[PDB]
Amino acid sequence: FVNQHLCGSHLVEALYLVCGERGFFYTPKT
Amino acid sequence: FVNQHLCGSHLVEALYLVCGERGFFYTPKT
Amino acid sequence: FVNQHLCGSHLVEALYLVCGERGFFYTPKT
Amino acid sequence: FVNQHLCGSHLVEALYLVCGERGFFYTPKT
Amino acid sequence: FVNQHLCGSHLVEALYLVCGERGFFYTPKT
Amino acid sequence: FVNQHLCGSHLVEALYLVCGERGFFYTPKT
Amino acid sequence: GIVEQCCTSICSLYQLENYCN
Amino acid sequence: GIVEQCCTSICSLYQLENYCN
Amino acid sequence: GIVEQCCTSICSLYQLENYCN
Amino acid sequence: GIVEQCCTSICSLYQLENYCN
Amino acid sequence: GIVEQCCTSICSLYQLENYCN
Amino acid sequence: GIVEQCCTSICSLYQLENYCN
Ligand SMILES: [Zn+2]
Ligand SMILES: [Zn+2]
C-alpha cells in the first residue's frame, strides 16, 4: 500500500522551489 | 548561465530517498 | 551542445505550479 | 485524496517532450 | 485509473542510482 | 566537472516513455 | 481536456499529438 | 506537519509559505 | 519569452507571475 | 518483475540490488 | 551508445526509437 | 555544503549519508 513515500516526494520538489534559493527543512513527525 | 538552480534539484530528489522516510534538511551556504 | 532542451524542461515544471491549478501557455519564440 | 494534482504533473512532462521544442498550452477545464 | 505508468517511473529513478554508474535493464513482464 | 552523470539521467526519463510500457535496457559502453 | 482523458486512461500518442501547436 | 496536511489535501500556497526559512 | 530570460538568468517570481492566465 | 513486487510494496534494498548488472 | 550520441547532441526520435525492445 | 561538493562532483554515498538526520 505504498503512497506516503511517493507523496512526500511530490512535496519536496514543490517546496524548495517556493523558497527560490534560500533553504528549508523537511521533518515528517506528529 | 543557469545550472546551480537545476543542480540543486537533482540532489534533493536523491537526498530524501537515501533517508528512507526519516527526515532531512537542505541549507545551501558556505 | 544540448542545454536549451533541458533548460525549457526545468521551467515548465516550475511554471504550472505557480498558477496553482489554473492553466498557462508555453510558446518559445522571439 | 490527492491524485489529480500529481496526475497533471505526470502529463506536462510527457507533453512538452512530444512537441520537440515547439510550444504547447496546458488549460485544464471542461 | 492511471497508476502503473507513474509507478514504473518512480522505480527507474531509484534503480539506475543504486547501480552507481554501471548499467541496468528494465523489462516489465510476468 | 560532473555532467555525464546528470546527462544520463535526462535520457533514461525520456527513454522508457518512448517505449510506452514495453521495456528497454540501458548499457553505457563504447 | 487532458485531465479528463489521460488521467483516467493513458491517452494514445496520436490523441496527445493533437494538443501540440 | 506537511505529510499530515498536504498529502491528504494540497495545502494552500500561504500555508506552504510558512514552512520556508 | 521565457527561454530568453529565465534560461540565461532565473527570472524573478513576479516576472514569472505575469505569464500565468 | 519489478512492476509486480515494488509497485505493490517498496521492495527491500537487497531485492532491488539483485537487479543491477 | 546513447551516452556518446545524445549527451553530445539530442539524438533524433527515430534514432532513439531503435533502442526500445 | 552539498551545493559546493556534489554539484561539482557526484558526492559518494557515504558522504551523502552523513547529511540525513
Ligand atoms: Zn536537469
Ligand atoms: Zn510522481
UniProtKB/Swiss-Prot annotation, chains G, H, I, J, K, L:
Transmembrane segments: none annotated. This is Insulin A chain. The chain holds residues 90 to 110 of 110 of the full protein. The lineage of its organism: Eukaryota, Metazoa, Chordata, Craniata, Vertebrata. Disulfide bonds join C6-C11. It comes from the Eukaryota.
